[PDB]
From a paper:
Recent work from our lab has shown that, in addition to classical FcR immunity mediated at the cell-surface, antibodies exert potent immune function from inside cells via a unique cytosolic IgG receptor called TRIM21. TRIM21 is a member of a large family of ~100 proteins with a common ‘tripartite motif’ architecture, comprising N-terminal RING, B-Box and coiled-coil domains. Instead of recruiting Src and Syk kinases, TRIM21 stimulates immune signaling via the activity of its RING domain, which catalyses the synthesis of polyubiquitin chains. Here we show that initiating ubiquitination is a key step in regulating TRIM21 activity and that a novel mechanism of autoinhibition and kinase-induced E2 enzyme recruitment controls its potent pro-inflammatory activity.
To understand how the B-Box modulates TRIM21 catalysis we solved a 2 Å crystal structure of the RING-Box protein. Surprisingly, this revealed that the B-Box occupies the E2 binding site on the RING domain. Comparison to the TRIM5α RING:E2 complex shows that the B-Box is located where helix 1 of the E2 would normally be positioned during RING binding. Crucially, the B-Box is able to occupy the E2 binding site on the RING by acting as an E2 mimic, forming similar electrostatic interactions. The RING surface contains a negatively charged patch, which is complementary to a strongly positively charged patch on both the E2 and the B-Box. In particular, Box-RING interaction is stabilized through a salt bridge between residues R118 and E12, which is analogous to the interaction between E2 residue R14 and RING residue E11 in the TRIM5:Ube2N structure. Taken together, these data suggest that the B-Box may be an autoinhibitory domain whose function is to regulate RING activity by preventing E2 recruitment. Moreover, the target serine in this motif is located at the centre of the B-Box:RING interface and undergoes phosphorylation in cells. The {1H}15N NOE ratios reveal that the most dynamic region is the linker (residues 83–102) between the RING and B-Box. This is in agreement with the higher temperature factors observed for these residues in the crystal structure.
Numbering used by the authors:
A (entry chain B): -2 to 129
B (entry chain A): -2 to 45, 49 to 84, 89 to 129
Write the structure that this text describes.
Amino acid sequence: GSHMASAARLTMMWEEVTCPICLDPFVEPVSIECGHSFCQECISQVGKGGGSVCPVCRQRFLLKNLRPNRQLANMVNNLKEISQEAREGTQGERCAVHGERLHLFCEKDGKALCWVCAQSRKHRDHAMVPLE
Amino acid sequence: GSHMASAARLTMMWEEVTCPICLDPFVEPVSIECGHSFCQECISQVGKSVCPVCRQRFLLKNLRPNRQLANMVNNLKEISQEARGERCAVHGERLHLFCEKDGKALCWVCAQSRKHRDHAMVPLE
Ligand SMILES: [Zn+2]
Ligand SMILES: [Zn+2]
Ligand SMILES: [Zn+2]
Ligand SMILES: [Zn+2]
Ligand SMILES: [Zn+2]
Ligand SMILES: [Zn+2]
Ligand SMILES: [Zn+2]
Ligand SMILES: [Zn+2]
């Protein structure tokens, strides 16, 4: 049957589908030699000229050995959907990256945030205020 | 905040972390060249060739760890634990069914999975 997924549990699941370079949910997730995964755009940037080292474990990698890791993108989609299936007859703007409702504004980044955004490493030290 | 994961949604997430070879949740998940992933054991034994899902060629030296998949398994098992009896070893959910073909005790995820859903099952007593 169904189960309640706590806030803490959802945070951990998001963590697993989050790029270590940009700290957003993975977009076109790919893995390098060592098996660590990244957004394809992100690791392509780090490896400009053909290669570099893994930002997590410092093992060497080549851009030609990029591998698609589609299950991670599927898992992002499953997590975004939990937010839309949520609403007990309810509808409004949703975070482009998490699919949760937007109720906060990051003054540093000058954009709206959901609660997942607010707690994440990417924003949790920024100044935030409620939307109005 | 919190959200209800429906049974349908849970099922879908389980499907993503299930090995196409043994039809259980990944144990030591690893990828081959096409990007398809498998338990290390399961794909190793296919080598001892061609991708069971899509048929693209692969080589065993090119296996890569895909640890996110294992971490997700662990996350999904905790969901059941945090809503809390005897528990499925692969899914963490409560056992209430018994498979007459395999002779083992099943959780609701087992029962609806490709692996046992065609098997004769009965309630535990
Ligand atoms: Zn990224
Ligand atoms: Zn690495
Ligand atoms: Zn967000
Ligand atoms: Zn911010
Ligand atoms: Zn397997
Ligand atoms: Zn394949
Ligand atoms: Zn089970
Ligand atoms: Zn069975």
